[PDB]
């Protein structure tokens, strides 16, 4: 009888995900739904378990933070009462980010500032959005502006950024684009230690931690706050029959 | 029919709370319970709502992160299937930290290192544990060792640490004890800006973010990881009838 929605994040300690969750919560409370959280840790098996538990407890709707391994078949019992965040699936409502647009905007900014030797610190191509799309957008920009690409794809963790930044720092390098704020935080620790002050850093996130600690890093906002509001509203709209599933892309903005 | 436990944190973006949650999750999965999270944001009214929703959905047990405003009367329908974390209540199972012990250990280390002018950056006395107990432990140490106390109690936020650190720095000040890692992170940003390198910082938390960014800060571990394991085990023990409610205090440890 109580209206309940579930939010399935991949990581409870992810700042990027928490920023989207922060705007979902007031929108759900205003709609009369009490929100509950669950964590997947990128496991499709754990997601399949959560979904069954939620179904048997008659939960009204689900906001699922998508990742590689989620199949349409495991989302079958939730077609009309589920919204995917960060990934899309045919016949499902989704709220996605503009990864290519985020990288092109950042690369243009660095290029207009005079930077020609810009290195990249990213995540492996198995991670479709943060990894593949972001890295390929960097490559497409380098190709179009006859720049020499220098990249390393260690992964998501701050410590991975710290351990692999030296690999992409060359004598001619003046700027470093990090696929995530977390990676920029790790890379920044190494540069501070080695007393490298000459490098302009750039990252995707615009998280409050990044803004506070490194005001000098150029950041691009993927729109986590907006994504959260949209996902909550799309979910309530379809569970109340006011809307059919839509696929929304949040535009990236600079500063 | 599915076994479910709820974890009610105050803030989803609190690193200190997430460290306790991190060790609760594997212990619940091993016991056969699927964990769900809710957020209170220090509102007793919101807690009263969550508890009712959980009761009507027949949730097996609750781990509640305590704060000022929670009464025994609102916990009445959960006496045997609830564990409090960070605060105690008569007749309730609880897992608490040693706030006084954490401050005494840190002050002794700073004192043994030769520091005599130690300033304090804390949180107001209305926050019983982080605020009152931590600040009073600092005062008791200063009294016992004939030291001059210099303190400011702005609150929990990183920005509050940054804005109020200047107030407690005197020309004789050699060390600064921060009630939380978050406060030390904020104070550290100000000191970096003002090019103050002479100060020895100390904080309570030993969070991975602090350890990675500031290896030079002296930290005390309140035992969030241990607290999480204990709370999960005390909860499953009482819901299965293996145990009666206990009040556990986790010892603080240095490094
Ligand atoms: O370091 P954090 O703050 O966690 O940011 C990293 C990254 O996090 C998210 O991407 C990851 O999770 C999503 C699901 O939420 C997956 O679909 C991706 O494959 C993961 O990479 C954000 O979407 C990213 O913008 C952010 O940079
Ligand atoms: O800045 P964070 O990492 O959140 O640490 C601050 C502080 O957080 C917790 O205290 C607060 O929440 C508890 C309930 O979880 C309340 O009982 C306190 O009154 C609040 O101050 C931790 O218990 C503290 O150790 C930590 O420093």
UniProtKB/Swiss-Prot annotation, chains A, B:
Disruption phenotype: Cells lacking this gene are constitutive in the expression of the treBC operon. Keywords: DNA-binding, Repressor, Transcription, Transcription regulation. GO terms for molecular function: DNA-binding transcription factor activity; transcription cis-regulatory region binding. Alpha,alpha-trehalose 6-phosphate binds at residues 11-17, 66, 87, 127-130, 134, 182, 224. The keyword Transcription applies. Induction: Probably induced by trehalose-6-phosphate. One of its GO terms (biological process) is regulation of DNA-templated transcription. Repressor of the treBC operon. It is able to bind trehalose-6-phosphate and trehalose. Homodimer. This is HTH-type transcriptional regulator TreR. The chain holds residues 61 to 315 of 315 of the full protein.
């Amino acid at each position: 009888s109580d209206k309940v929605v579930a939010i399935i994040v991949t990581r409870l300690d992810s700042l990027s995900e928490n920023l989207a969750v922060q705007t979902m919560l007031p929108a759900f409370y205003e709609q009369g739904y009490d929100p509950i959280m669950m964590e997947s840790q990128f496991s499709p098996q754990l997601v399949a378990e959560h979904l069954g538990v939620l179904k048997r407890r008659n939960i009204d709707g689900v906001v699922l933070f998508g990742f590689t391994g989620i199949t349409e078949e495991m989302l079958a019992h939730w077609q009309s009462s589920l919204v995917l965040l960060a990934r899309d699936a045919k016949g499902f409502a989704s709220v996605c980010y503009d990864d290519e647009g985020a990288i092109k905007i950042l690369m243009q900014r660095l290029y207009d500032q005079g930077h020609r030797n810009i290195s990249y610190l990213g995540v492996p191509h198995s991670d479709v959005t943060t990894g593949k799309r972001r890295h390929e957008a960097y490559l497409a920009f380098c190709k179009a502006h006859k720049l020499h690409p220098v990249a390393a794809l260690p992964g998501l963790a701050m410590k991975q950024g710290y351990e692999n930044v030296a690999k992409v720092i060359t004598p001619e390098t003046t700027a470093l684009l990090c696929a995530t704020d977390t990676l920029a935080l790790g890379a920044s620790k190494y540069l501070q230690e080695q007393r490298i002050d000459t490098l302009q850093l750039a990252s995707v996130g615009n998280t409050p931690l990044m803004k506070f600690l490194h005001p000098e890093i150029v950041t691009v906002d993927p729109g986590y706050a907006e994504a959260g509001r949209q996902a909550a509203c799309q979910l309530i709209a379809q569970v109340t029959g006011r809307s059919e599933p839509q696929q929304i892309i949040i535009p990236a903005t600079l500063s």
